Design a binder for this molecule. Structure first.
Ligand SMILES: CC(C)(C)c1ccc(N(C(=O)c2c[nH]cn2)[C@@H](C(=O)NC2CCCCC2)c2cccnc2)cc1
Ligand SMILES: CC(C)(C)c1ccc(N(C(=O)c2c[nH]cn2)[C@@H](C(=O)NC2CCCCC2)c2cccnc2)cc1
Lengths: 298, 298
């Protein structure tokens, strides 16, 4: 079992470089529109309290330089939607995939294509944390890199990267420019809230462990939803709902382990630890695999 | 810090499906040649002691079905190079990237594009273990998936997947068809040797931890190389060579921490464990980031 990202080719052909004045970052070119963070129009002076609609009124089309690799795209229009700048260009991207813009929930996973100067640099799998941050690997200029899922030839874009938070985690928007989490695109003392562990994903990963070789944490006992959630609360774990239990249905049937029987296993791990043992090569309880991820793998 | 794969798009465009008889697996389509494991021509009862020279002489071109997406590629010639089959096809791949074939050494990392029936499934980062196996995530029919790097526009193909070993790890060849390690493409009793931890990579990852602001595991001690190796080998670590010490020179200069001072830190980490802490988010010492990988990502 490995953390696996989607093949990124359909998204690589959409990445472009956007330059406004002295600032460069990445854009997403779909049909004849390039999408990028609206803070590309912020200058080092305006970073504390930018007035984005005033900064945008001041800009005109020729203020933006868009490059798809070596070819320059001419900007013929500009507008803002929430925290995303939309640049209308003269040429439709001839490699535009089938795609949707989707907004995901905390606990859901996606692939991130990390880019710099419009050039794809790496791909990795991420999860939206309960506190709405991303534990990404992003350096300066990574803004505009996107997160996505693929469903049989359709790319569902869910994340555009905007900024780094002081604890080293990352904050961004959906592709309609709505932030995930209580964050703003300005220079501020904002910080990630206290995070929690994604319980349904840890259970999915324990099922993944059983499907492979690892069975030492199983036991004869079961628990109740109410009893387990009291322990989840103590250990900073998200509450487990009936809808989570239903989503884990297929894995419960495939193994001989009912969800609340597995909760009995997880309850034990949360207090007594792992007693030196390892689960799928990890000394920690892994929470960035969804139930679907465990089934798409395996 | 994430295990980051290379963007897979250049390789996705080269994956095809190869069928011989009742067996289907993946091939790699570069220019007018499809490369695939020669065991595609093995039959269900050939599997213990096939004579591949005798199996191949009995095939004609039309016994190979090659499919690139929905298009059938016509095989016009075939040839065997060590353990890879080279199928000459009627059409050059119009999306062939700049590429090279490279044989790697243990400790080296690469991205794997897992494919089934010629269609890519996921991408993840991998490493060649000291025992010449791969701890991959491969299912039945993954044979012919390739491992690659892409430093500066050129795809370096370094691994083609052939088989699973009894411990669940994986064996394969370079793109000239020479196996990594002492494995053969036969159904046998073969098993991977005792594996070791890749010491030079653990040290690189500790340097990455310092670069990203974590110093808690450092100590006031140094060590000689020979004393380090005498201790580390008692934890099943690979010996560290003067070559490895030279290789770590740039990370030592960037962080100001002498290589043998980091070795003293590692000795203490092996002695004490983590004591509840993590390093770059891991509760184990990570050994599948090379010194090159750390410089790439940091
Ligand atoms: C204008 C605004 C909103 C204040 C801003 C400023 C800088 C950036 N950062 C660009 O690297 C960058 C590149 N081009 C434009 N910005 C980085 C970033 O977030 N530092 C934050 C640190 C202080 C508080 C606000 C910004 C960054 C680093 C690593 C990974 N991700 C992003 C993002 C947003
Ligand atoms: C003919 C030969 C060399 C013995 C062989 C037979 C089967 C396969 N395996 C194919 O899946 C497969 C082969 N051709 C199409 N698919 C699987 C495989 O290695 N089983 C081994 C089981 C023990 C005995 C040797 C083979 C496989 C590969 C990767 C990940 N999980 C399962 C590989 C090689």
């Amino acid at each position: 079992f490995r953390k696996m990202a989607f093949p990124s080719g359909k998204v690589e052909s959409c990445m472009v470089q956007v330059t406004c004045g002295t600032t460069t970052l990445n854009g997403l070119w779909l049909d004849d529109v390039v999408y990028c963070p609206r803070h590309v129009i912020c200058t080092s002076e305006d970073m504390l309290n930018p007035n984005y609609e005033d900064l945008l009124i001041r800009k005109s089309n020729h203020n933006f330089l868009v490059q798809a690799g070596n070819v320059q795209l001419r900007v013929i229009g500009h507008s803002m939607q929430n925290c995303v700048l939309k640049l209308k260009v003269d040429t439709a991207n001839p490699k535009t995939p089938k795609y949707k813009f989707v907004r995901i929930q905390p606990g859901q996973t996606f692939s991130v294509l990390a880019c710099y100067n419009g050039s794809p640099s790496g791909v990795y799998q991420c999860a939206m944390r309960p506190n709405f941050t991303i534990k990404g690997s992003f350096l300066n200029g990574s803004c505009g890199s996107v997160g996505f899922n693929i469903d049989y030839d359709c790319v569902s874009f869910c994340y555009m990267h905007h900024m780094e938070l002081p604890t080293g985690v990352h904050a961004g928007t959906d592709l309609e420019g709505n932030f995930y989490g209580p964050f703003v695109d300005r220079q501020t003392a904002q910080a990630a809230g206290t995070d929690t562990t994604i319980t349904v994903n840890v259970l999915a990963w324990l099922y993944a462990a059983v499907i492979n070789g690892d069975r030492w944490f199983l036991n004869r006992f079961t628990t109740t939803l109410n009893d387990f959630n009291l322990v989840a609360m103590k250990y900073n774990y998200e509450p487990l709902t009936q809808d989570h239990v239903d989503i884990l249905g297929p894995l419960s049937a495939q193994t001989g382990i009912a969800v609340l029987d597995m909760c009995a296993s997880l309850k034990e791990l949360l207090q007594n630890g792992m007693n030196g043992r390892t689960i799928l090569g990890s000394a920690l309880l892994e929470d960035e695999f969804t139930p679907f991820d465990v089934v798409r793998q395996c």
